[PDB]
């Protein structure tokens, strides 16, 4: 079999895209072939977006894959919700339900909610960006009940070049007035670097702050550059280059070719890119499972319209919602898994803290194994100093007699 | 000589089309005229503003009045957006600005704000509908730092 495959691809994401390639370089085999049609327009503009989708819609494709962003989600899933193309992403999940669409990335919300009682704060800033969505301002808020959370969230996301210098200038000084010392920020990946640089440049990362990043791929960063600065920065990891099935792929990715496969040479890797090769694994084993169930995408010539009116879906479509759903399998996220409604379960998440040694797992999380602490390994043993503070008046604390030389 | 104009309603503004006839009825005029091609379809979900979109668009109207919900927004500002041909709302007013876009509905928050500076509050519980947008649960939570206000949300 051959099975054509829309790819509605974000620009910008050529490490993704090698992803992409890697894993249909693993995973094609000649019972069925899953066989590219991608296009690359702004994920921004819904109409750019829609009108490639109708294109690679009107090639009658068994499922799309790709990118989207809180600019077109509702854009895009309406269409899955009329048209029944099976449709799979790693991207941001939606707060709500609905069929044909995968979810891929798991859910924050639940980590890094139960981070907040394992560092046991009742006091935080909070600096966010619209693009994944203020699903975790609103879960958060939401949340501000049950431990009584003082909580300020500040919209970090309309600092643009025009002024992304004194932006963050008052920014930080609303948090020295406030004298805010822990300090929660939900940015994307490419963002968290711009932020980093002026909480260096205006030094704030001594001891006394104490930082998350809401990111699943933490690591991804010059983490380095402020692993120096005595705050406690610790923050989440789906990927972890530790486990040997994935390390084996962690090798092989590495390894291959950098400028065929554009950036994939490094040791690491954006877990967005690394849940391509899930979401690549998923699309294959439910052709299989179709072909193993003996249900077969063999379907009109006809690739039909995605603005028929009144539009009508194809029967078939619903047949591959279910072999998708019915998917479970290991891969650079784990033994990963979906409920019927499209978002994944089991999905098994680590804490690692950026100790001066590099980021170290203190636990992992799931949702029944809630913050399961790891902090058996060492690094940090020995009685790190203990910092004592107190006051210069006789005779309770002096000078020692030789303290200019002491 | 009229032009040609398309509208969209949403399923239960019954309100809002009666006094949009209304409106018609009133300020048509002797010298010209509007030519409204209306569809009275779903809102709430993007196919059914998509597909009217393409059916008055194709139709050639030049100017179309219409709704739409956080859902839907991005589908028509982006449409628009694009394809030069304007839109105009009483819907809540969006973060962006994009072109070709009567937002009307005037904002609320300044005004919101500066009654909670009359009262002068300082500790009190905000709610909020997610769906018209949490431009308000944005300008009042961002103002809170400011203004040092206590919000919950």
């Given at each position: 079999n051959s099975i054509q495959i829309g790819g509605l691809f974000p620009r910008g994401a050529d490490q993704e895209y090698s992803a992409f390639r890697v894993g249909m370089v693993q995973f094609s085999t000649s019972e069925f072939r899953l066989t590219p049609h991608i296009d690359n327009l702004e994920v921004a503009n819904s109409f750019a977006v829609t009108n490639a989708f109708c294109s690679q819609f009107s090639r009658g494709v068994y499922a799309i894959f790709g990118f989207y962003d809180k600019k077109s989600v509702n854009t895009i899933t309406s269409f899955c919700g009329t048209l029944h193309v099976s449709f799979i992403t790693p991207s941001f999940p939606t707060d709500g339900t609905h069929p044909f669409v995968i979810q891929m990335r798991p859910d924050l919300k639940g980590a890094l909610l139960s981070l907040i009682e394992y560092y046991q704060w009742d006091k935080f800033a909070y600096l966010y960006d619209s693009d994944r969505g203020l699903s975790t301002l609103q879960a958060v808020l939401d949340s501000a009940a049950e431990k009584k959370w003082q909580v300020t969230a500040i919209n970090v996301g309309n600092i643009n070049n025009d002024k992304k210098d004194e932006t963050y200038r008052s920014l930080f000084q609303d948090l020295e007035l406030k004298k805010e010392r822990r300090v929660i920020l939900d940015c994307e990946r490419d963002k968290v670097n711009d932020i980093v640089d002026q909480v260096i440049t205006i030094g704030?990362?001594?001891?006394?702050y104490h930082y998350i990043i809401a990111?699943?791929?933490?690591?991804?960063?010059?983490?380095l550059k402020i692993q120096f600065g005595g705050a406690e920065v610790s923050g989440f990891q789906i990927?972890?280059?530790?486990?040997s099935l994935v390390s084996k792929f962690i090798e092989r990715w590495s390894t291959l070719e950098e400028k065929e496969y554009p950036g994939a040479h490094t040791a690491t890797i954006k877990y967005t890119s690394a849940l391509t090769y899930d979401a690549v694994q998923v699309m294959t084993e439910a052709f299989r499972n179709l072909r193993k169930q003996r249900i077969e995408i063999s379907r009109r010539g006809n690739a039909g319209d995605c603005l028929a009116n009144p539009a009508v879906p194809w029967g078939q479509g619903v047949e591959i919602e279910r072999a998708l759903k019915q998917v479970q399998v290991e891969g650079l996220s784990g033994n990963i898994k979906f409920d019927q409604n499209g978002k994944r379960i089991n999905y098994t998440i680590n804490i690692m803290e950026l100790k001066t040694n590099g980021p170290r797992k203190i636990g992992y999380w799931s949702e029944v194994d809630?913050?399961?602490?790891?902090?058996?390994?060492?690094?940090?043993?020995?009685?790190k100093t203990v910092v004592v503070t107190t006051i210069l008046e006789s005779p309770y604390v002096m000078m020692k007699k030789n303290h200019e030389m002491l």
């Open positions: 704030k990362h001594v001891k006394g990111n699943l791929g933490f690591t991804d960063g010059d983490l990927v972890d280059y530790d486990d809630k913050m399961v602490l790891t902090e058996d390994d060492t690094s940090g043993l020995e009685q």
